[PDB]
Amino acid sequence: DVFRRELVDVEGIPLFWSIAEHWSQVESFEARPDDILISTYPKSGTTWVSEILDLIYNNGDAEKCKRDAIYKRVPFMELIIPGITNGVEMLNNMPSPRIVKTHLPVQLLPSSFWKNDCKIIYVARNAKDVVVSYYYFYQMAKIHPEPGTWEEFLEKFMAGQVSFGPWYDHVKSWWEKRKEYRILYLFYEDMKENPKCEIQKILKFLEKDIPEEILNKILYHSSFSVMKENPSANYTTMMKEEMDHSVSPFMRKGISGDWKNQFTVAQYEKFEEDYVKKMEDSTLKFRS
Ligand SMILES: Nc1ncnc2c1ncn2[C@@H]1O[C@H](COP(=O)(O)O)[C@@H](OP(=O)(O)O)[C@H]1O
Secondary structure, eight states: OOSSOOOEEETTEEEOHHHHHTHHHHHTOOOOTTOEEEEESTTSSHHHHHHHHHHHHTTTOTTGGGSSOHHHHSOBTTOEETTTEEHHHHHHTOOSSOEEEEOOOGGGSOTHHHHTTOEEEEEEOOHHHHHHHHHHHHHHBTTSOOOOSHHHHHHHHHTTOSTTOOHHHHHHHHHHHTTTSOEEEEEHHHHHHOHHHHHHHHHHHTTOOOOHHHHHHHHHHTSHHHHHTOTTTSSTTSOTTTBOTTTSOSSOOOOSOTHHHHOOHHHHHHHHHHHHHHHTTSSOOOOO
């Protein structure tokens, strides 16, 4: 059974066992100067931004963006599972310009990205909404260990004992990294509030100037209501053994503030006290 195993340490970070097993392929990954890397802590808007980028690259052409599932159009680089998928292989075989997905902490990113000085789009999301999204994702996406109860999972999340390690260090170190490499550092909440503004930021970062009409096409097709029902974007093409949407759909709620529905008041107060200690020295600021 490739599913439901315990995580394995890779350079200090808990990762899926099969990523650890095939780490050589990941560490030696060959980037290209025109790769665009989408980098996120899990559940922070990866799919949303991936779809936006593929829409941009296809001039808003919805049919072209249905050429394959999002996880084939924008490969999850480090995800290697025996008999199931190999993100590195998928990317090696992909023509430029490539859009690459990762969740690796900064210190684990393949060094080729730095050597090629790639542009990177990092997406962050408020921690409370992330842990809620991640709890349900752990339940449905069977590569993860069992999450246990919400209480148990929340404690694991606070302790960084989850796939890809602690949220706190992930977002903080990627934020610091923006001084060394070209990183457009976006917030899920900003995309919720004014998606047009955020897509315009992406376009500027990519040095692309497009007609208003194309921008509006991209906006329309990247909305939650459209993506939720789009089988090329909503992960329903995944084998049921890998993702069981009857447990929880991938496109779950797509809002900011679902944390209020999940956290008890006591859990919230405890989480905030812990958060302040971990985050007060970083210049990073979030809305919940
Ligand atoms: N177009 C969109 N607009 C808003 N949220 C979206 C979205 N597409 C996906 N999401 C949300 O992004 C989260 C998945 O993130 P990732 O792609 O990084 O795994 C899920 O959050 P919820 O579980 O809070 O609904 C999902 O519903």
